[PDB]
Amino acid sequence: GRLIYTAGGYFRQSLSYLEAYNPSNGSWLRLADLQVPRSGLAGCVVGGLLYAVGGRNNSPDGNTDSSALDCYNPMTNQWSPCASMSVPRNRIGVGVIDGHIYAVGGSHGCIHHSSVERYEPERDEWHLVAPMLTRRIGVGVAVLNRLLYAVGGFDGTNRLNSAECYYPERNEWRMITPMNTIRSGAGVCVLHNCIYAAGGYDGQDQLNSVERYDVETETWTFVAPMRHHRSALGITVHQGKIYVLGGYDGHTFLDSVECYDPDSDTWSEVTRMTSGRSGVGVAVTMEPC
Numbered sequence: 001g002r003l004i005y006t007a008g009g010y011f012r013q014s015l016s017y018l019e020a021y022n023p024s025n026g027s028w029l030r031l032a033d034l035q036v037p038r039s040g041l042a043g044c045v046v047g048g049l050l051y052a053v054g055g056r057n058n059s060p061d062g063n064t065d066s067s068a069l070d071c072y073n074p075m076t077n078q079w080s081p082c083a084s085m086s087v088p089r090n091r092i093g094v095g096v097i098d099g100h101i102y103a104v105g106g107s108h109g110c111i112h113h114s115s116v117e118r119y120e121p122e123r124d125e126w127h128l129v130a131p132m133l134t135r136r137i138g139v140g141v142a143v144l145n146r147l148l149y150a151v152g153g154f155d156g157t158n159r160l161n162s163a164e165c166y167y168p169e170r171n172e173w174r175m176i177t178p179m180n181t182i183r184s185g186a187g188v189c190v191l192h193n194c195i196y197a198a199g200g201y202d203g204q205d206q207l208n209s210v211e212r213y214d215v216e217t218e219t220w221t222f223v224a225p226m227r228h229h230r231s232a233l234g235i236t237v238h239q240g241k242i243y244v245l246g247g248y249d250g251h252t253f254l255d256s257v258e259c260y261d262p263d264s265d266t267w268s269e270v271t272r273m274t275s276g277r278s279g280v281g282v283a284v285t286m287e288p289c
């Protein structure tokens with residue numbers, strides 16, 4: 001892949017935007033809109049295709065949680081619907097293992113899901129797997145060494161520092177070491193041998209702190225803070241660097257895009273999105289055409 005794709009998000013209402021940033025030249029490209037506006041969704045890529053998963057359409061004419069999975073083909077610049085999930089999942093997290101998409105947690109109205117389901121592109125089918133031990137919305141999800149991690153979030157009552165791991169061949173969840181920080185709507189991704197959790201909301205404040213979990217040591221360590229406090233950010237990895245996109249700082253719907261260089265342990269401002277927004281879906285794949 002070469003571009004960072006950001007899909008959907010929220011500013012005043014849920015958004016249909018699909019725009020792609022090229023780190024190699026600083027350029028933004030506006031591409032085909034989502035068929036349905038949505039915020040609180042997740043993005044991922046499988047086989048070169050971009051998927052938009054879950055979310056909610058917050059709109060003046062009503063609020064609708066999304067069970068939708070939609071597929072964007074950069075070759076054609078077209079969105080195609082796929083099979084829908086078992087349930088709507090706003091403020092979802094997702095992870096890809098072995099070409100399958102895991103949809104994790106999220107909300108449907110006042111239901112905070114612990115349920116998890118898995119999509120198989122070759123069959124266009126979703127199937128439920130073992131539920132998490134905890135209900136989590138605004139859940140951070142990442143994959144390392146073909147294990148799936150669910151990190152932080154909101155269980156309906158408390159924002160969470162807890163995290164858990166799913167072992168596919170056991171179809172089983174187990175708790176891991178909790179983070180040192182309560183975080184809901186953080187950005188969670190993998191880089192090298194570590195799960196990173198950037199920012200989030202704790203029920204009182206939006207956070208700039210960043211910590212990472214080393215699967216070998218089973219401990220969380222803080223790294224340098226982002227320049228901007230943010231919850232409901234998008235996060236992705238592009239060429240061995242973390243990028244964080246948008247979110248909310250308690251005052252502004254951020255257009256800020258920051259990137260993290262693990263070797264210098266520094267965050268730097270890279271570009272700004274064309275407009276401020278929170279709750280985007282983000283993933284990396286090839287240039288269109």
Ligand SMILES: Cn1nnc2cc([C@H](CC(=O)O)c3ccc(Cl)cc3)ccc21
Pocket residue numbers: 012231232248278
């Ligand atoms: C249209 N508009 N303008 N400012 C807003 C703030 C919120 C709340 C916070 C509040 O109510 O102050 C909110 C903002 C961001 C997240 Cl991620 C979650 C909730 C909701 C809609 C808003």
Ligand SMILES: Cn1nnc2cc([C@H](CC(=O)O)c3ccc(Cl)cc3)ccc21
Pocket residue numbers: 040041091137138139153154159184185186200201203206231232233248250278279280
């Ligand atoms: C005022 N404020 N600031 N940041 C917030 C985040 C949420 C939730 C998580 C929660 O309720 O803990 C949220 C999580 C993820 C996404 Cl994409 C969007 C919203 C709710 C209010 C918030």
